[PDB]
Amino acid sequence: GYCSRILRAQGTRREGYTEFSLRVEGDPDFYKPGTSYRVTLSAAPPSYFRGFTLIALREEEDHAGTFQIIDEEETQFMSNCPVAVTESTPRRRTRIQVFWIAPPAGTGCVILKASIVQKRIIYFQDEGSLTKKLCEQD
Amino acid sequence: KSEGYCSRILRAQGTYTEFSLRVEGDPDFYKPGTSYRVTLSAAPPSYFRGFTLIALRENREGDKEEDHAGTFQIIDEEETQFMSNCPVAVTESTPRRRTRIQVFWIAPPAGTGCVILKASIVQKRIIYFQDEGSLTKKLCEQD
């Protein structure tokens, strides 16, 4: 896209299931328009991350719901790409969380995508454990 | 030995634009012993987290300390540092999102010959540097 290009500039592609996981609490099968979901990004022990990004896109542009910050000490909108969420400061973390408010009916499938930096290498993928797709109910 | 300092600093073989490496005053040539201000910057709305900066004798690979020329000097010790595996190279100390970093580089003695200052924004175990483009600047003796 455009934010995507910025977010991937220094990136190492690692597809599939990895020690870093993007999940939605309650493991929903689909989204309901306008519902808020708690999205989490975490490291399996003893791993951690120092930085991340998180973006939602339409299956690709950006009328893809709305993030809402839960923890201002740990996370913020990225000024470079205001629709994306990112760390407030580099520091070792094992979990971050945010709200995502599902878009209006007729939007179609949304893909939530996270990138992760632990030390120097920035990891991203198109599919796997940093990727969560949710569609409207069949 | 099989594992010297700078073993992970290499030249890309075969073949970006938002990112620029610049020497303050944009000198044509270098004067030995002078301190030059060198900045890596991202054009808005771009950013980088880590980076690696080196200065090489022209036509050298970079993977031996003896390939490197002049002396980098740290300005912001908080979040830039010398690379522990290659003490003549400069890197970030944290993966903070950045739009600019700066260092001094003291030019080498008369007779050193042309130097290529090079930055890389690609963060991998092996760091490949481009021979030309926006992340490199060549400086020869002003002579």
Swiss-Prot record, chain A:
Subcellular location: Secreted, Extracellular space, Extracellular matrix
Residues annotated as domain Reelin: 1-138
Tissue expression profile of the protein: Highest expression in lung, lower expression in brain, heart, kidney, liver and testis, and lowest expression in pancreas, skeletal muscle and ovary. Not expressed in spleen.
Cysteine disulfide links: 3-81, 109-135
Quaternary assembly: Binds to the central extracellular domain of APP and inhibits beta-secretase cleavage of APP.
Purpose: Cell adhesion protein that promotes the attachment of spinal cord and sensory neuron cells and the outgrowth of neurites in vitro. May contribute to the growth and guidance of axons in both the spinal cord and the PNS. Major factor for vascular smooth muscle cell.
Identification of the protein by name: Spondin-1
Annotated source species: Homo sapiens
UniProt lineage: Eukaryota, Metazoa, Chordata, Craniata, Vertebrata
Residues of the full protein shown: 42 to 185 of 807
Curated annotation (Swiss-Prot), chain B:
Domain of life the protein comes from: Eukaryota
Compartments (UniProt record): Secreted, Extracellular space, Extracellular matrix
S-S bridge residues: 6-86, 114-140
Tissue expression remark: Highest expression in lung, lower expression in brain, heart, kidney, liver and testis, and lowest expression in pancreas, skeletal muscle and ovary. Not expressed in spleen.
Residues annotated as domain Reelin: 1-143
Role summary: Cell adhesion protein that promotes the attachment of spinal cord and sensory neuron cells and the outgrowth of neurites in vitro. May contribute to the growth and guidance of axons in both the spinal cord and the PNS. Major factor for vascular smooth muscle cell.
Subunit structure, interactors included: Binds to the central extracellular domain of APP and inhibits beta-secretase cleavage of APP.
Protein name according to UniProt: Spondin-1
Species this protein is from: Homo sapiens
